[PDB]
């Protein structure tokens, strides 16, 4: 539906949609921009990420509300209210899965294969792990282990590149480690791995802060605080 709009106009309108808090529109504009077939700049990658994270974030929050109601409905002593809670949870779940599949499809056709610089490749592989992780959050059936392993594999490739090619304070490296640590804690039932990763990431970043400008220091320490927040919650 965006095929007739100029790439630059799609990017301009994505920024307007962000200012207006119209994240579904923002995501549709950025999908159109990706589908023009050119690589994305750093700024454009962050617009793509902001848009879809906000869309899926609303869906995930709604899914958790509905899942909790459904859980309470199946406790002993609960009155039978019919199929409606399950149906509506399933409706929201299917829409969420559709958004994840859309993002994964953009990554596979063809953002990842054309991404050669570490900053872009790690960014996209982190995104791939993230959207498999969101699929894992709602998965219950025969492919659940494979969904979890797909998240793990994408995160692991991103980590390997990030450790070789980026300083320990790089914000993409830090955000990747934050999210892989959450994956370990919440998805893979590996809280010790989650804690170890968060701590090592924090400590290695701390030791590299001395190399940074004031502005880079602000960027890196903001994400380090997110790691610390999780360590405080988990220990």
């Amino acid at each position: 539906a965006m095929g007739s709009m100029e790439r630059a106009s799609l990017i301009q309108k994505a920024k307007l949609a962000e200012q207006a808090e119209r994240y579904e529109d923002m995501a549709a504009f950025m999908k159109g921009a990706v589908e023009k077939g050119e690589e994305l700049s750093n700024e454009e990658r962050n617009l793509l990420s902001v848009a879809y994270k906000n869309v899926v974030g609303g869906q995930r929050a709604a899914w958790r509300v509905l899942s909790s109601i459904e859980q309470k409905s199946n406790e002993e002593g609960s009155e039978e209210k019919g199929p409606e809670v399950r149906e509506y949870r399933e409706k929201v779940e299917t829409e969420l899965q559709g958004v994840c599949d859309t993002v994964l499809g953009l990554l596979d056709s063809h953002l990842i294969k054309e991404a050669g610089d570490a900053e872009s490749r790690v960014f996209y592989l982190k995104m791939k792990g993230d959207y498999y992780r969101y699929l894992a959050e709602v998965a219950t059936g025969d492919d659940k282990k494979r969904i979890i392993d797909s998240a793990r594999s994408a995160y692991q490739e991103a980590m390997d590149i990030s450790k070789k090619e980026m300083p320990p304070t790089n914000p993409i490296r830090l955000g990747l480690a934050l999210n892989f640590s959450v994956f370990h804690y919440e998805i893979a039932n590996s809280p010790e791995e989650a804690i170890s990763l968060a701590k090592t990431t924090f400590d290695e970043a701390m030791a590299d802060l001395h190399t940074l400008s004031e502005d880079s220091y602000k960027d890196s320490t903001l994400i380090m605080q997110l790691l610390r927040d999780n360590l405080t919650l988990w220990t």
Binding site: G57, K126, L178, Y185, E186, I223, L233, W234
Partner: peptide, 8 residues
């Protein structure tokens, strides 16, 4: 009280 992931 909800753990943090990479957002904004």
């Amino acid at each position: 009280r909800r753990r943090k992931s990479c957002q904004a």
